[PDB]
């Protein structure tokens, strides 16, 4: 029968929600079914950090970070491999895997 109990990711007690668009399938899904991945990176990225930081005109100047909120859908998540197939008794976790 059902392969879920939530049948989404959450729609409990609520009749409807506003949908939201995938970033790379250009698709349309619910907000509370979409894979929500927030991202932190440095602007310059860490390979060329030494070559840049020395060439600063100043001294004490931490670098900015890059803040982006990404919403992926069901298909464009599996294909970019931020998620994968899991076992029958191993789908019952809600827990993110540690870094």
């Amino acid at each position: 029968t059902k392969k879920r109990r939530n049948n989404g990711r959450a729609k409990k007690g609520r009749g409807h929600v506003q949908p939201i668009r995938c970033t790379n399938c250009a698709c349309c899904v619910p907000k509370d079914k979409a894979i929500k991945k927030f991202v932190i990176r440095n602007i310059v990225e860490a390979a060329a950090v030494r070559d840049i930081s020395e060439v600063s005109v100043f001294d004490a100047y931490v670098l900015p970070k890059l803040y982006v909120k990404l919403h992926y859908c069901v298909s464009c998540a599996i294909h970019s491999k931020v998620v994968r197939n899991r076992s029958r008794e191993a789908r019952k976790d809600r827990t993110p895997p540690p870094r």
């Binding site: 399938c25 602007i43 310059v44 060329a48 840049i52 005109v57 890059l66």
Partner: protein, 136 residues
Amino acid sequence: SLGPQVAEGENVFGVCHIFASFNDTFVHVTDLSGKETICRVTGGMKVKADRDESSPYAAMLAAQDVAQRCKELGITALHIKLRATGGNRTKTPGPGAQSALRALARSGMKIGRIEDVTPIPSDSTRRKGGRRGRRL
């Protein structure tokens, strides 16, 4: 080419306006005000193949020329403004963002500051592709 009459201990600061993402890279060095400007070079001018316009080395080769004409004039330092496409689009840098910096810095030019600027809506008009979106 005539620069200002002092730059010996100080620097003159331009703004670099690096453009990001796919099928294109611009580097467009301007005034502090940005009202007037100097040379403007693309990765479609360095490399012609219609498919390497977003490549790392095409962005590096661009800035490797632009940074010469800066110092030729008297512009020695650069504040940096970024631009990803945005406007309910990808809103994420291309490959040729990291690239041009590494090349232009080591060519000899100074870096003063760096920041993110991207046009991000507070929710605006519907995105091209339809309900089902692109597939294949």
